[PDB]
Write a protein that binds this ligand. Structure first.
Ligand code: HEM
Ligand code: HEM
Ligand SMILES: CCN(CC)CCc1cc(F)c(F)c(CCc2cc(C)cc(N)n2)c1
Ligand SMILES: CCN(CC)CCc1cc(F)c(F)c(CCc2cc(C)cc(N)n2)c1
Ligand SMILES: C[C@H](O)[C@H](O)[C@H]1CNc2nc(N)[nH]c(=O)c2N1
Ligand SMILES: C[C@H](O)[C@H](O)[C@H]1CNc2nc(N)[nH]c(=O)c2N1
Ligand SMILES: [Cl-]
Ligand SMILES: [Cl-]
Ligand SMILES: [Gd]
Ligand SMILES: [Gd]
Ligand SMILES: [Gd]
Ligand SMILES: [Zn+2]
Lengths: 401, 401
C-alpha cells in the first residue's frame, strides 16, 4: 500500500508513504489511467481540524496549549457563524503549503520563500486593482522577481465572489480577422472579446497588453488599464542571429496566475493571484511555438534557411532550440529573472530528495514536470513519480460566466 | 466514458473502448502510478471465449454456426486437456491484435501489416535458432525492413517454457571495466555476464554483438552465435560535422524484442520475438544520450565547440538534435528503414483517428508515446490519452535466471 518509486538513471528506490494521506480522489481507476487529462454543512470542520493540526505539527507544537485553544476557537467560530477566519500566520503557512502540494509545479524548490499579501479586508474592484498593482510592482522588483500571492476575501454563502476574469495578470490580446483567424495570442481571444465588450479600445498589435476585468461581489466587472510602467516586458533578440530582433517578438516579465481557487482548511479563495518567475520553455517552446499559440516555428526556420520540405532535417527541433536560446539570452540581458529547463529540473530532483526526508514523498505529475523540449535530457524524465491530491491546494474553477 | 480532448485543434471524443478493459492497472482514485515503468480452467475458458468472440467478429461471423462450433470445441478441449490449441488464422489475428493493443507503441498505424511465422512445432533450441535466423533475414530484407513476429510453442502443463534470454535479438555487449565503468552498452551488463558464464569468449569493443542464449523446455540455455552477415549495422556519420564519423559509433538495423510474453485468449507464448523498424529518437536520444547508456552528449557538445559550462546555453539540446540528425542521415544513406519522431507521431494521430472509428477508442500511454526530445513540437503532446489493458497483449515477464 506504499508505492515503490524507482529512479532509472541511478537505480535508487524510495517509497511514497505521503500518498496514503490523499484526500480528493483523482480521475484514475484500476481499469484506466486518466493521468494525461488537463482537467480530470458541518464538514467544513473536518477540513479545518485537519489543517489546524497540519499547522501545529509544522511548528513542532502538536498537542500543546495553543493547539488546543485554536481548535476550540474554530469550533466556536463555525458554531457561531458557520465558517471561520484564518490567523495571519495560518494564511501564510497555508499558501506555502498549497504551492508545495501543487503536483504540476516544477519550481517547488522555492516553496518556502513566498511573500503573502493579506487582502482579506478588500471591498470593491477599485480596492482589488490597487492590491493587484502593489503585487505586480513588488513581484516585478525591476526584474529581480520575487514569488508572491495576494489573498482576497474568502467565499461566504449568500454573497457573491471576488474573481479576476483574466487567466493571468498580463496576457496579450487576440483579435479575430476579416477571416476568423487571430492576430496576437489565440489563447486569449475570449477574454479579448470580453474586454472589448466592456468598453476597452482594442489595439491593432500582436502584443497589446490586455486590461483587467475585476469583479467585486455581485457587481458587473470593471475594466482597469494597467500602468504601462508597471508591466515589465522583454524584447526578444538572439545572441548571434542578428535578424531575430526584427521579428518583433516580446514577452512579459511576470507570470501571475489569476484564475485559480486557493483552498485552505476548508475555506475557499476564488481570488488569490500568485506569481513567480518563468521557466524559459514556457515562453520559448509553448507560448511562441505551440500551433494554437503564436505558432512562430516555421517563420524562424525560414529565417534560419532550414530545409522545411522534410521532417527528417529536424528543422522544427533546431528552430525551437534557437527560440529558447533567444528567450534566455533576452531575459538575462534585461536582467529579468528566468530559469532554463535544465536548472529547473535539477532543482526539482533536489526538491524530491528534500521532500522524501521531510514528508515521505512528493505529489508529482510526470507529464507536467518533464519539460516540453529535451525531455529525456533532464533528470526528471528518468524519475518515477506518484500523483495525488493534498490540501491546502490550488484548484481549478469555472469561468465566472 | 472518459472524455478526451485534443488541445491543438479542440477535438473531443469519448473512449468507450476503455469500459471493456479487462485486466487491472496500477492507478486508483487516490493516486496515479501512470509513470511506473513496470505497472484454473474457468478463467482460461472465459479468456478464450472472449478471444474467439473477437476473432469471429473480425471475419464477420459473430453468432454463426462456425462461431458456436469453435466455442464448443475449445470448452471440450479445455475439459479433456486443461488447455487448447489456436488455429493458424486465429494466431495471426491474435498476434496483430496484441500489437494493436500495445499502449506504449507509437508505430501502431502499421499493426495490420505484420508477418506471422508459426514456429509452434519447434522441438529444440537448435531449431529455435534456425527460426530466429530466418526471422532476422526476412525482417531485415537488406535494409528495407518488414515487421514480423515468430511464435514459438505455448506454455503448457508438464513441460518447461521456451525462452530467449536476450532482451533483443541484436544487442551490444557491456563489459564491466577496470575502473568501475562499462565498455559498450551498460544496459546489457547482466546478459553479457550470462553469455560469458555460458561459454562465450568476450570481445572488448564498444559495439560487440552478443550471442543468443536460447532455452528449450527443461533444458539449460544454449549459446548460439549470430552469423555476422545476418546482423545489418549502420556506421554513424553526420552530414556536415565530419569529425562525427571519428567517434566510431554504430547501431544495428533491426529492433527485435525477444523477452516479452505474448498472450492470446488465455494462452501464453513466453517466446515470441517481434521486430519492426526504429524511430530515430530511440537511437539518437535514448541509446546514445541517456546518462546510463552510451552517454555521448557532453563529448559531442565539446567537439561542437559549445559552451558546456552553463546550462542556459542549451548545449545539451543542441548536441542532442545533431546526434539525431546523424542517426537519420546515416540510416537513410545506408538505405535502412527509419522514421523520425515527427513522421511517427503524425502517423500515430491517424491511428488514433482510425481506431476511434473502428473500436470507439485506443489505449495509449502518453508518457511513452510522446518522444523524448521535442515533445510539444509533435501532435501527440497535445492529445489527451486513456491508458488501459486489452487482450491479446504483449506482457513483461520475469527474467529466466
Ligand atoms: C518561483 C518560480 C516558479 C517557477 C519557475 C514555476 C514553474 C512552473 C511551471 C513550468 C509550471 C507548469 C504549468 C504549465 O506549463 O502550464 C508550473 C505550474 C504551477 N505552479 Fe509553478 N512556478 C513557480 C512558482 C510558483 C508559485 C509561487 C506558485 C504558487 C504560490 C506556483 C503554483 C503553481 C501551480 C498551482 C501550478 C499548476 C499549473 C496548472 O495546473 O495549470 N508556482 N509552475
Ligand atoms: C514498424 C515500426 C515500429 C515502430 C516505428 C515502433 C515504435 C515503437 C516505439 C518508439 C516504442 C517505445 C520504445 C521504448 O522507448 O521502449 C515502441 C514500443 C512497443 N512496441 Fe512498437 N514499433 C514498431 C513495431 C512494432 C511491432 C511490429 C510490434 C509487435 C508486433 C511492436 C510492439 C511494441 C510494444 C509491445 C511496445 C511496448 C513495450 C514496452 O513497454 O517496452 N512494435 N514501439
Ligand atoms: C490548465 C489549463 N491552462 C489554463 C487554461 C493552464 C495554464 C496555467 C494555469 C495555472 F494556474 C498555472 F499556474 C500555470 C503555470 C504558469 C506559471 C505560473 C507561475 C507562478 C510561475 C511559472 N513559471 N509559470 C499555467
Ligand atoms: C521497459 C522494458 N525495457 C526492456 C527491459 C523496454 C523493452 C522494449 C520493449 C518493446 F516492445 C520495444 F519496442 C522496445 C524498443 C525497441 C523497439 C522494438 C520494435 C518492435 C520497434 C521499435 N521501433 N523499437 C523496448
Ligand atoms: C494532453 C496533455 O496532458 C497536455 O497537453 C499537457 C501535457 N503536459 C503539460 N505540461 C505542462 N507543463 N503544461 C501543459 O500545458 C501540459 N499539457
Ligand atoms: C519514469 C518514466 O516512466 C520512464 O523514464 C519512461 C518515460 N517514457 C518513456 N517513453 C518511451 N518511449 N520509452 C521509455 O523508456 C520511457 N521511459
Ligand atoms: Cl504563460
Ligand atoms: Cl533499442
Ligand atoms: Gd537571407
Ligand atoms: Gd563541416
Ligand atoms: Gd575522444
Ligand atoms: Zn493514472
Amino acid at each position: 500500500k506504499f508505492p515503490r518509486v524507482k529512479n532509472w538513471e541511478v537505480g535508487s528506490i524510495t517509497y511514497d508513504t505521503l500518498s496514503a494521506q490523499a484526500q480528493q480522489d483523482g480521475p484514475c481507476t484500476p481499469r484506466r489511467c486518466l493521468g494525461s487529462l488537463v482537467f480530470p454543512p458541518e464538514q467544513l470542520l473536518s477540513q479545518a481540524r485537519d489543517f489546524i493540526n497540519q499547522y501545529y505539527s509544522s511548528i513542532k507544537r502538536s498537542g500543546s496549549q495553543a493547539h488546543e485553544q485554536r481548535l476550540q476557537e474554530v469550533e466556536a467560530e463555525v458554531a457561531a457563524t458557520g465558517t471561520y477566519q484564518l490567523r495571519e500566520s495560518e494564511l501564510v503557512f497555508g499558501a506555502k503549503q498549497a504551492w508545495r502540494n501543487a503536483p504540476r509545479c516544477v519550481g517547488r524548490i522555492q516553496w518556502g520563500k513566498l511573500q503573502v499579501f493579506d487582502a482579506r479586508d478588500c471591498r470593491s474592484a477599485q480596492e482589488m486593482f490597487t492590491y493587484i498593482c502593489n503585487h505586480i510592482k513588488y513581484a516585478t522588483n525591476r526584474g529581480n522577481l520575487r514569488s508572491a500571492i495576494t489573498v482576497f476575501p474568502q467565499r461566504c454563502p449568500g454573497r457573491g465572489d471576488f474573481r479576476i476574469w483574466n487567466s493571468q495578470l498580463v496576457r496579450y490580446a487576440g483579435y479575430r480577422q476579416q477571416d476568423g483567424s487571430v492576430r496576437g495570442d489565440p489563447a486569449n481571444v475570449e477574454i479579448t472579446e470580453l474586454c472589448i465588450q466592456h468598453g476597452w479600445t482594442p489595439g491593432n498589435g500582436r502584443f497589446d497588453v490586455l486590461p483587467l476585468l475585476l469583479q467585486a461581489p455581485d457587481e458587473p466587472p470593471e475594466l482597469f488599464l494597467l500602468p504601462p510602467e508597471l508591466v515589465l516586458e522583454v524584447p526578444l533578440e538572439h545572441p548571434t542571429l542578428e535578424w531575430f530582433a526584427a521579428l518583433g517578438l516580446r514577452w512579459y516579465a511576470l507570470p501571475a496566475v489569476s484564475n485559480m481557487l486557493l483552498e485552505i482548511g476548508g475555506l475557499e479563495f476564488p481570488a488569490a493571484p500568485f506569481s513567480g518567475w518563468y521557466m524559459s520553455t514556457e515562453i520559448g517552446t509553448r507560448n511562441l511555438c505551440d500551433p494554437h499559440r503564436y505558432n512562430i516555428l516555421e517563420d524562424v526556420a525560414v529565417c534560419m534557411d532550414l530545409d522545411t520540405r522534410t521532417t527528417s532535417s529536424l528543422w522544427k527541433d533546431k528552430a525551437a532550440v534557437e527560440i529558447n536560446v533567444a528567450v534566455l539570452h533576452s531575459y538575462q540581458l534585461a536582467k529579468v529573472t528566468i530559469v532554463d529547463h535544465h536548472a529547473a529540473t535539477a532543482s526539482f530532483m533536489k526538491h524530491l530528495e528534500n521532500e522524501q526526508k521531510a514528508r515521505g514523498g512528493c505529489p508529482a505529475d510526470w507529464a507536467w514536470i518533464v519539460p516540453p523540449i529535451s525531455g529525456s535530457l533532464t533528470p526528471v524524465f528518468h524519475q518515477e513519480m506518484v500523483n495525488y491530491f493534498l490540501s491546502p491546494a490550488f484548484r481549478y474553477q469555472p469561468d465566472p460566466w
